Design an enzyme around this catalytic site. Sequence first.
Site, mmCIF file in Angstrom:
data_model
loop_
_atom_site.group_PDB
_atom_site.id
_atom_site.type_symbol
_atom_site.label_atom_id
_atom_site.label_comp_id
_atom_site.label_asym_id
_atom_site.label_seq_id
_atom_site.Cartn_x
_atom_site.Cartn_y
_atom_site.Cartn_z
ATOM 1 N N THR I 1 0.897 -1.198 0.158
ATOM 2 C CA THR I 1 0.423 -0.077 0.035
ATOM 3 C C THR I 1 0.648 1.842 -0.192
ATOM 4 O O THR I 1 2.074 1.084 0.358
ATOM 5 C CB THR I 1 -0.922 -0.147 1.310
ATOM 6 O OG1 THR I 1 -2.344 1.228 0.939
ATOM 7 C CG2 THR I 1 -0.461 -0.370 2.127
ATOM 8 N N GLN I 2 -0.323 2.935 0.036
ATOM 9 C CA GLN I 2 0.461 3.985 -0.108
ATOM 10 C C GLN I 2 1.069 4.314 0.929
ATOM 11 O O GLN I 2 0.238 4.757 2.052
ATOM 12 C CB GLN I 2 0.324 4.642 -1.465
ATOM 13 C CG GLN I 2 0.243 4.279 -2.621
ATOM 14 C CD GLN I 2 -0.199 5.164 -3.699
ATOM 15 O OE1 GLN I 2 -0.689 5.870 -3.286
ATOM 16 N NE2 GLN I 2 0.117 4.534 -5.164
ATOM 17 N N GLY I 142 -3.543 6.106 1.521
ATOM 18 C CA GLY I 142 -2.984 5.756 1.966
ATOM 19 C C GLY I 142 -3.512 4.685 2.045
ATOM 20 O O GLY I 142 -3.742 3.471 1.274
#
Lengths: 238, 196, 201, 245, 202, 246, 213, 233, 216
Positions: I1-2, I142
């Site tokens: 993930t970011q 995010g």
Amino acid sequence: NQYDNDVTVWSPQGRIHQIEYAMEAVKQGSATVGLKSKTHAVLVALKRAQSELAAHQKKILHVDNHIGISIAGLTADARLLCNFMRQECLDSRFVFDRPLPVSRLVSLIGSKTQIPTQRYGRRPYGVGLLIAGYDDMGPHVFQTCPSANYFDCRAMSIGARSQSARTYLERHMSEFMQCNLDELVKHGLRALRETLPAEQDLTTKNVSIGIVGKDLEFTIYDDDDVSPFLDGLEERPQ
Amino acid sequence: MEYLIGIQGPDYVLVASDRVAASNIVQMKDDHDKMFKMSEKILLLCVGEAGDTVQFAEYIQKNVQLYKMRNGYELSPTAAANFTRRNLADCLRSRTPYHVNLLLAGYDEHEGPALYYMDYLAALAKAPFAAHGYGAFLTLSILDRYYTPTISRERAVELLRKCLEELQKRFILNLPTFSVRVIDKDGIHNLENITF
Amino acid sequence: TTTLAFKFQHGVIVAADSRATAGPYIASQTVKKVIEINPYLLGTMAGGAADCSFWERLLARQCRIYELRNKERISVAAASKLLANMVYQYKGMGLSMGTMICGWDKRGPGLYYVDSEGNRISGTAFSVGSGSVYAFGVMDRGYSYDLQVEEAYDLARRAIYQATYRDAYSGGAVNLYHVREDGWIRVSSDNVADLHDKYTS
Amino acid sequence: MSSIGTGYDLSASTFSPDGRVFQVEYAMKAVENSSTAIGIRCKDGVVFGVEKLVLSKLYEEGSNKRLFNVDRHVGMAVAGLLADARSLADIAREEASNFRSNFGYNIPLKHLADRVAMYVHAYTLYSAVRPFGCSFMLGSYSVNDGAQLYMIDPSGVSYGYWGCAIGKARQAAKTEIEKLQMKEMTCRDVVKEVAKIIYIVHDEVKDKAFELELSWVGELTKGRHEIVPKDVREEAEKYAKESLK
Amino acid sequence: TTIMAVQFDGGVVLGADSRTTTGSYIANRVTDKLTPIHDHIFCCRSGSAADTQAVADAVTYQLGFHSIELNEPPLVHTAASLFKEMCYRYREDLMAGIIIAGWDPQEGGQVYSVPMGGMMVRQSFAIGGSGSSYIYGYVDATYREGMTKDECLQFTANALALAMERDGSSGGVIRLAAIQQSGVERQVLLGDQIPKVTISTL
Amino acid sequence: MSYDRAITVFSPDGHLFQVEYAQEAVKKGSTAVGVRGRDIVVLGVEKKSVAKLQDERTVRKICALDDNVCMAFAVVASVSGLTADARIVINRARVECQSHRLTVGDPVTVEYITRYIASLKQRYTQSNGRRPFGISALIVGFDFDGTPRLYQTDPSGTYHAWKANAIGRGAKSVREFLEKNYTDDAIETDDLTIKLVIKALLEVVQSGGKNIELAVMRRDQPLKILSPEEIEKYVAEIEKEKEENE
Amino acid sequence: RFSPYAFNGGTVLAIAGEDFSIVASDTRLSEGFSIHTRDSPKCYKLTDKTVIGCSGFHGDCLTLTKIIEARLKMYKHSNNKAMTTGAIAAMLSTILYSRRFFPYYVYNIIEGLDEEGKGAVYSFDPVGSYQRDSFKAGGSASAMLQPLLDNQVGFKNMQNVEHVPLTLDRAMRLVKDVFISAAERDVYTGDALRICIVTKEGIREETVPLRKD
Amino acid sequence: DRGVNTFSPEGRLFQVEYAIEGHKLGSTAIGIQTSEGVCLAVEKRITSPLMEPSSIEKIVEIDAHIGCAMSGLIADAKTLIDKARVETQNHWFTYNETMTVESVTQAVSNLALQFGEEDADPGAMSRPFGVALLFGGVDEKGPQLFHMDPSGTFVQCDARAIGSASEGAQSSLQEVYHKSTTLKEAIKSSLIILKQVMEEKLNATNIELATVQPGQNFHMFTKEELEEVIKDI
Amino acid sequence: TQNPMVTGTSVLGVKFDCGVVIAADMLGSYGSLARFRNISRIMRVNDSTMLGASGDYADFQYLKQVLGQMVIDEELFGDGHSYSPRAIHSWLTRAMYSRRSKMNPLWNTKVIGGYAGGESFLGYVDMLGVAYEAPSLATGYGAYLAQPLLREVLEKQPVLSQTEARELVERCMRVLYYRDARSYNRFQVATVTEKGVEIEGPLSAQTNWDIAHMIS
């Protein structure tokens, strides 16, 4: 005298004479009725031509598809204010992505109008605009004058022979507000016909309508749908 | 760049110059039915060589300048003045999106001294001399150009000298070429000399 | 004397040739690509090389020819229009520009045909090509090359060159665009389909 | 003054034999000709009151704005010509707007009054632009001085006031403020009282009707500057009419 | 680079400051005094790298310098803390150390603000930042008990500064102390060689 | 730099003040004549007041903007209009002339340069703090098909193609007389085009064949400025031919 | 395609195929980023007014900017001209933004569908590397070939000697739209969740969601 | 003293009032719009026919489907038209449609008045234009003719004449022209009025003719066609 | 993930739309890298008179937003009869700022939730640190988008019952699980509930932090 020799030179009248000259330019200009409901804001304007073998052309100029103006005064001077207005709508769309708040929009014009009034002998812009706009607060019909002062009106009529149109706005002051959009344009043509003598009466050629609102963009009807609205006379008995 | 040839040998008043016809963009010779030896005035020549494309760009920039100075003087150009001004203008334009990175050749007839030939590099360094060569060819030609005159040239020996070099340029150096323009300019008229 | 833009002039009239195809490799998105731009009959242009750079300089040129024509009233010089555009191109580098356009239009001495580059080439020749594929095209055209070629030989020469090109370097597809400038006012001949040209040659 | 045919009253980069420009004085008459703006300093906030003349019976409140909200704790009440009032409003808004955003606290008024008056005055000096023929007040509630009210004249002079009136009956209004103690009184009571002075000023044989705009920045709103809530606004006007008679 | 700790008290405030500035290996500056002033009541200390911090302090100091004259009374602490932050959000790739803002405002006389290298302005009972303070970063919070008194706080700010110096190689050992009150800033320099430094591992 | 209040303003007189002063200032002037040949297009001015203690160099009314474009200006008036004023119109056109010349591959279109000239004198009339020049110019050159042109502007920028046009001494007076002079068989060789320019100039020149200054321009070769001693030889030939006619 | 980067897509392939009176426009619904769906409704199609709808795909900041340029210019064109804005013009406003970027192209891919002032409906594709054309069929995106090859067969019937799936109609065109957004989700998982069907005719644009794969 | 930027005691601007009278010194513009094209006739305003008609321009193409004929103060007009050419072409370039006669007219009208010796610089005006334009062209809707004047008023016209007598030029129109009429009569109806408004003769070197028609660009009349129309009075 | 920016973050953003209210859960701490330097944090602001904003992630975009909101509210106050600001107008204006904030190196993340109900439109807008904004019903960006969002979407998914109370209980459970799953998280949190009349909520709230992997 010698207190209107420039607009820097103050009058012992409390208002410079030059500010007041600019008010005559707007009166000499086109009869215009501006009324609002609680969804839509309507600009009814009277066309005029400069020749016999010419077909009359709109005195509604577009600012944009969400805020629009009607001129009373000079066509050139109205357009000069218009270009600035057009830019603001172009920025509003970038920043907010809504129709620019009408009250906000009028104060920025007022700032511009303020500037030649400050300068040495320079001309205050001799147009009055009736500005119809639709924002999140509701419709607004504003009166802008040759000064920086704006009025938020329920209905106002400015231009030539506009008092007869003004008694109409008074009579149906509550009515505009509750009414449906077609009726809002109908009271405007009834009011606008009141400026003219009993003899002279509105026809599809000399009628320009600018409608803006919640549901629709600014559209100009010059013979597009002027006719069903035009229907029914009711003029001031002179 | 790193193509395209020039050579000049100045004589008693004559100057003989040759350059190849060939403007190659990409891989193939795009134009060839035009020459890229320019008359900037009728007493002044610039022959530009390096980038095939870059030659016209430099020529034009000089063309307005050369004329503005002509105005200033209100009489014909001065050779000394032409080398320095073209040099300054070109080193500044090299950095510019409108670049120069050409080895140029000034031929001018000077109002006082006489015949003048002015050397210009790709880096762009001004010098008047009487034995100089241009383009990719300048590395190849210059020692030879040093040797074969005593001071300046004599046309008969030059002619022999020129034909000998033109077989070499095709031979060792790589151009698209199939014709060459050979010219002598005496300072008031353009003369065509023969191609090898 | 390169890519899908080529123009050569002959003794009957003039031929203009272009493709309408885009996408090297499997990647494609434009199938009716107008490499020969000409919204008007007065000036004609061609692309070549890089997709963005041709299109950009030529839409700026599009405005530019129209402006000259308007100012003189009558149509101006083919050279002046093209050269005003050349000053812009040299300066234009630093955008990954690498424009290789061939400018065609009518000049007062006659038809003018000039060769444009992103590094500012301007030379007048009887034949010009921009790109990299006409490097292949020069072998069959040159071999048969006369400059007094028949109108009929030229149409057959262009038709065949695309078909043979398709075979040799793949890239053609959808349509073959042919345009002829005859006299001094241009016309678009035909937008002839790819599948037809394959059989003929 | 003088009415010389070249300059002095026809310019304003020219001083008289005494040292004064006649042009600012002609402008000073302009505040006197139209309706009053009253503003009194409390110590919990400031209460402003401007009577907006109903010239046309087809207006609604927010028309011919004499009351501006300068920030979210700064007010501006003006009297005199509305066009010069607008300019003064615009500068004030930008000066107040940068200070809350950047610093993070409420603006002490005394500096602000001096800066804006500097703006007025800088233009007086010049002959190329005009003196401002408005008189205006600035009012704020602060956490460095508490309430402050300053009044700046069409000349660019700044003085602080416990309680001011600028308008068409300064003498009658100031005197009523003197009698009353509002100097350190609670903002709520003040609302009624400021309106009541407006009632004395107004005539039913020089005016038809007015629409009250008062502005809060005080304990009801918790120091937030808003134009008077419709219920409160009405209550205060209601008292003003009832108590005279 | 330096060793800075500044602790907020329920009384008013106490500061504690380095004696050395260290570069890469060699000590750049052998006697340290940090009071960049934005106002005469409010001060800041330039913690962590000197340069990064100082330029932030300096732009902030010019606006606050202007401001204190302007208002007539000196500025409030909270005004200075927003300005220190304002620079630091932009130039966060060029500064990432720590700014320690401490003193008296006019709105209470009791504020300690931390503007961090990752940004945030919050008030905390104790903070240590810089070179050797990072070592003890969780710890300075740990050592006090919230809302401690002026005398007790004074011994703790001295004792934690010694323990941080011992811990990192960016401090020396001299505790320079500053007691901040309504009065002004008064500074005292308590010697080191004689008092006891915190225990060291075998 | 420029004047905050405008020199030129619309006032009631029909035009403008500075245009009005400007028409007066080329009327009261001396003769500048331009005849359009079929060889060379040649311009000449009546007065420079040469007397052999001074030499012309850039002192000439005739200045070449370009390799094939030249203009001769008659700022010249009751007491003499300004070489100072002319030079600005000259500087701005010359750079533009050379930029167009670069762009067209054959000799520069006069048309562009004259239209341009007209706008340069007009833009000053709309520009704050400025006023128009009091010149009239004979814009000459050859086109991109080699078409010789003799064009004229007045002070505010208005332009026409002409066979031959003469300005100053009353502009209308002299130009109607140049039609009479003009022959198409008198432009067939280079000396005959030059003889038509000179005949209009002789009329009221003080100490002629020295004051008379005329320059020749070729097809794309630069301007050749003729010295008054060389011009004098032609002046003698016509001045006798002219006597013979009466 | 798309992956995490710093600004990146998450559904949307814009397809338009023109008959000659309708353009059926299909765009996938979802607001996506990372490797997950943030929310199901709401696509990267945005309408400039209601006459024309442009769909931009990839880096969404860029998508918000594209729509605003194309719509602002429509409004300038309306004020002066006193007629509607055509496709070809909204498309140009969009070009100038697209041409800007070429050292590394724009990370947005536009397809504008409307009618231009020819009285018939037109679909223009500009590329983010920039080149543009009018087409009778078109798939647009950086998985542009997948709606595109169906549209080439079904309206244009290139290479077909007997195949046109069904007669060319608005409804036929709509059937094909729903099926392709579902079909891609198996092979390429970057487009999924819901289908947005927009129908463009002379009536204008009406939008409809339909849940799917 | 005070400006020309001040209001008169009439309550109107001094400078705009002067500008209309200024028009009357010079050239004429006659544009007749028929549904078969828009024709523009304008006077070259000669002193002799020995003034070459090779490249006297006063009817100039704004676009290649819109032409413009000018009247009034001829000098001031030359810069207004040159300018008008770039702005119309920026519009033609972006929209890639054939420009509408009404869009060119609105755009040029705001430039008329920006005057003032304050709030202006060298690129802005310090005087109002006294040039009245007639823009005539064919668009998508069809042939339209628009009249522009210094006060910025734009109006739709089927026949509009302005000239040396603006009033004079118009009174003749009523008399000759009638609403639905052929192209060939439309050209002729201009030559009869043209004389009336001029104080000058009918010469082929003194009139200039241009037609913009459906499917056909702005055309400039040559000496032979200039004569065909002179014959038609 | 970011990943968010790896400096100073405020983290954790829930946001789900209910029937006229939206509920949001935000970490109330300030982790500098991961160490929880300041465990009470202000990240909830009043965007406009009847609009509110609360954001999670990198702090430098929140600090920008402080300046921005002050100006937006101040200008709207000037009319003094408001407009009744809708969510969208601010959000797009906030968009422009977040765009800049991305450009700093190791790009800053923000996810903001705006709620207002004005005119007769309920607008719930989401802002990304990318500068992406849109109307939505559930949002996360995010890291939230991979892991807590899932807990929210699935609980919602059986029976769609969107209530303020249901979100409130879910948020209490959520805090023990986020502290466990995420390393920039703590259990000292702020619960924000947004409405068409302004922002309603306290600051600090504390509830369970239990590890569920050592019992099991």
